[PDB]
Amino acid sequence: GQVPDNSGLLFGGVFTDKTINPMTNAQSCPAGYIPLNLFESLKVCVSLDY
Amino acid sequence: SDGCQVSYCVKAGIFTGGSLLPVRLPPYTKPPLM
């Protein structure tokens, strides 16, 4: 529902071992992001700072 | 730590998330009007 803002997480993009992430032009996460293993080869960049 | 999100609260002005060194030193005021 109406969750408090902006307390939460955002989406910083995904990247695999065979694809390329256009938001960073690399197979990693930008500065200030955490890579999370969502699947066997999928990594999601999660941001914390607003 | 084992997936626990640990964060610290700091001034947004000081920490701008840039690799450039925030060299803020003199002056301590804008150029005063004539």
UniProtKB/Swiss-Prot annotation, chain A:
It is a multi-pass membrane protein. It is found in: Cytoplasmic vesicle, Phagosome membrane. Pore-forming protein that plays a central role in antigen cross-presentation in dendritic cells by mediating delivery of antigens for cross-presentation. Dendritic cells bridge innate and adaptive immunity by capturing exogenous antigens on MHC class-I molecules and presenting them to naive CD8(+) T-cells. Acts by forming a pore in antigen-containing compartments, promoting the release of antigens into the cytosol, enabling generation of MHCI:peptide complexes and T-cell priming. This is Macrophage-expressed gene 1 protein, processed form. It comes from Mus musculus (Mouse).
